[PDB]
């Protein structure tokens, strides 16, 4: 059930070789110039089904959620997943910085895309919950690739249900606070990730945190939410003042303390516009390139159950910089997770 061809290509010059995927390609160029039929990481395709995932023995599911009609700003995040997948052909699944083969370590699979019902945010969000559910119930941790920032509403909801009587942490990294109680009467748009997590029966204010805030696309009520509910906000200001590693470790401890699971949503507009022009609402005064990698590394050491990444818009990026940045967000999280796991006898 769990197989892939190293360097993609079958036919006469197929490569066979248990480990060929972590080494220079031997018979041909693989997909480094031409994409062909690339999955995320060249991983096996596996339907988002608990049985199929289980029998493959997959511990990470890449699942795209391109839904971009749950949001208040501008469409475009629907195109991100394709550019992320394409960008992975520009890397090997082996990461020398961590000495791990990500692909075999996690038995990662690509669960394709969650389908959408254009115009219907309610039904599309339900599909997301259900697709995520299959991944968890199959015994895997999930990488969710958006799609607009409505994604954590179904994402957290799904992990909330799977966690049961246990407790769940919620980390939200973003230049925007995302705590509208409603937007023009709507409870489930892309700017209500945090209040909707707090509503989940097993998600508690003391295990919730926000990082990345700056600038004036942040109504007072979004700030008020964190004040009134005693939820830690670490502004970009504080992360620069006090240091990324200091602030990250502190809030990863907070959101994991006496929790069974952790939901981590990461908006690419947390990244400085200089590094990520391809975004729904890009913002200056954000994470630098090296700091994005560092945060991914730190996130990896602590670990989460679902990591989601939202709002990448490749149309507003004429280069490869956005897509490759989003590849590294994921690959550094997995490389760091694996190294941390291996330093504990696993």
């Amino acid at each position: 059930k769990w197989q892939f061809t190293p360097h993609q290509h079958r036919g006469p010059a197929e490569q066979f070789g248990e480990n060929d995927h972590i080494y220079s390609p031997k018979l041909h160029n693989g997909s480094f110039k031409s994409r062909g039929l690339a999955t995320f990481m060249g991983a096996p395709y596996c339907p988002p089904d608990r049985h199929k995932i289980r029998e493959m023995g997959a511990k990470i599911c890449f699942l795209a959620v391109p839904w971009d009609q749950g949001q208040i700003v501008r469409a475009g995040a629907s195109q991100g997943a394709a550019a992320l997948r394409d960008a992975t052909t520009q890397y090997f699944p082996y990461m020398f910085e961590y000495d791990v083969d990500l692909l075999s370590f996690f038995r990662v699979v690509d669960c394709g895309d969650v389908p959408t019902v254009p115009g219907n945010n309610i039904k599309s969000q339900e599909y997301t919950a259900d697709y995520v559910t299959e991944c968890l119930e199959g015994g895997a941790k999930v990488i969710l690739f958006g799609g607009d920032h409505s994604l954590p509403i179904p994402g957290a909801k799904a992990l909330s249900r799977f966690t049961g009587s246990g407790k769940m942490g919620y980390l939200h990294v973003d230049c925007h606070l995302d705590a509208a109680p409603d937007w023009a009467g709507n409870l489930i748009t892309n700017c209500s990730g945090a209040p909707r997590a707090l509503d989940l029966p097993n998600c508690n204010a003391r295990n919730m945190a926000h990082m990345g805030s700056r600038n004036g696309l942040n109504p007072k009520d979004w700030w008020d939410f964190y004040v009134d509910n005693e939820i830690r906000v670490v502004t970009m200001s504080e992360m620069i003042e006090r240091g990324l590693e200091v602030c990250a470790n502190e809030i990863f401890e907070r959101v994991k303390k006496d929790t069974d699971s952790l939901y981590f949503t990461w908006d690419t507009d947390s990244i400085d516009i200089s590094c990520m022009p391809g975004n729904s609402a890009p913002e200056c005064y954000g994470l630098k390139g090296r700091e994005v990698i560092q945060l991914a590394r730190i996130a990896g050491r602590h670990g989460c159950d679902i990591l989601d990444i939202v709002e990448f818009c490749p149309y507003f990026d004429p280069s490869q910089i956005g897509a490759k940045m989003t590849v590294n967000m994921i690959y550094h999280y997995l490389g760091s997770r694996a190294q941390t796991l291996r330093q504990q006898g696993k």
């Binding site: 600038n215 696309l217 007072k220 502004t235 391809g278 005064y285």
Partner: protein
């Protein structure tokens, strides 16, 4: 009403104005009456520019970018609603430079008469010559002016291509203003090769104490900026603050008429903005040489907007002009 501070509750197509400001004519009496602290004036004038074209579209793009932000700035607990008005644009002829400048002059004098702070959006950098002259004349010979400008180019050409009021001459003119002592002048960010030897020679001759980008990095930036803020604001009656965003690193501000590697990061400029705000006021704010045809995702225009609006927010915070913390949406 304070509904604008908060998410819309739900249940007249407006205008291209700085910050969704009201329009108010370029008239001292109307301006004093309106109750705002700042008056935005566009100046799509391009004819001092010896380099790549595009700055005349900056005022439109700058306005548009500003529309995208709420007026509320949670970091400062400040609301910018009503603090500014937009006077629209100084109408220019063409192939008519002398008259163009005269019109800019009149526009700035008028705004200054009102007691409001002009925010002047170019257009090329030469517009700073005549905006600075206007402040000079406004305050008169018995008062003291300070000048601070951010940019990669000194612009200290005594003359350029036989002319005297092109953008590369701008500092050579401004430092000749009679009530502007060279000791109250700062220039921050100069670097790279768009700085011919005579600009250096003249600067030394006049004792222009510019803070090159090398000097800034070597000092850890902020301590040297602080001393130059001091020289410009201590014992002056009025201060002019100008920005060419090629002070910033290219990556941070591509959409400028002459980008330059090796400049300020956005977070450095935001710290600098707060340091300027500590002094609790400014007389004229200019930004020149935005060039949106060369901008990617409006990165430069976006950054300019953040810088200008944070400066407004920061001045208001230090002035105590905050909003009520206690106020909530369910009111």
């Amino acid at each position: 009403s304070y509904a604008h501070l908060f998410s819309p509750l739900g249940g007249a197509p407006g205008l291209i104005t700085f910050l969704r400001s009201a329009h108010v004519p370029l008239n001292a009496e109307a301006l004093k009456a309106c109750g705002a602290k700042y008056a935005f004036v566009g100046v799509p004038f391009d004819e001092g520019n010896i380099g790549k074209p595009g700055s005349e579209d900056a005022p439109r793009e700058f306005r548009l970018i500003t529309q995208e932000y709420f007026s509320y700035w949670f970091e400062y607990n400040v609301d910018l609603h009503g603090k500014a008005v937009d006077c629209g644009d100084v109408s220019m002829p063409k192939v008519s430079p002398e008259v163009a400048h005269e019109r800019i002059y009149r526009a700035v004098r008028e705004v200054l008469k009102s007691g409001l702070i002009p925010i002047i959006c170019g257009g090329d950098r030469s517009i700073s010559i005549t905006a600075a002259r206007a402040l000079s004349d406004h305050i008169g010979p018995q008062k003291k002016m300070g000048y601070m400008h951010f940019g990669a180019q000194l612009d200290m050409a005594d003359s350029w291509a036989g002319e005297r009021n092109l953008a590369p001459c701008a500092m050579a003119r401004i430092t000749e203003l009679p009530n502007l002592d060279i000791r109250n002048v700062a220039h921050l960010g100069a670097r790279n090769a768009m700085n011919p030897k005579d600009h250096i020679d003249l600067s030394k001759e006049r004792g222009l104490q510019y803070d090159s980008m090398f000097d800034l990095f070597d000092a850890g930036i902020y301590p040297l900026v602080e001393r130059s803020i001091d020289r410009v604001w201590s014992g002056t009656d009025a201060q002019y603050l100008g920005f060419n965003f090629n002070v910033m690193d290219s990556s941070t501000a591509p959409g400028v008429t002459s980008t330059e590697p090796g400049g300020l990061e956005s977070r450095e400029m935001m710290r600098i903005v707060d340091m300027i705000a500590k002094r609790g006021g400014v007389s004229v704010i200019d930004l020149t040489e935005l060039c949106p045809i060369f901008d990617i995702s409006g990165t430069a225009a976006r950054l300019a907007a953040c810088v200008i609006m944070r400066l407004m927010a920061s001045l208001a915070a230090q002035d105590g002009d905050v909003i009520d913390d206690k106020l909530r949406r369910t009111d």
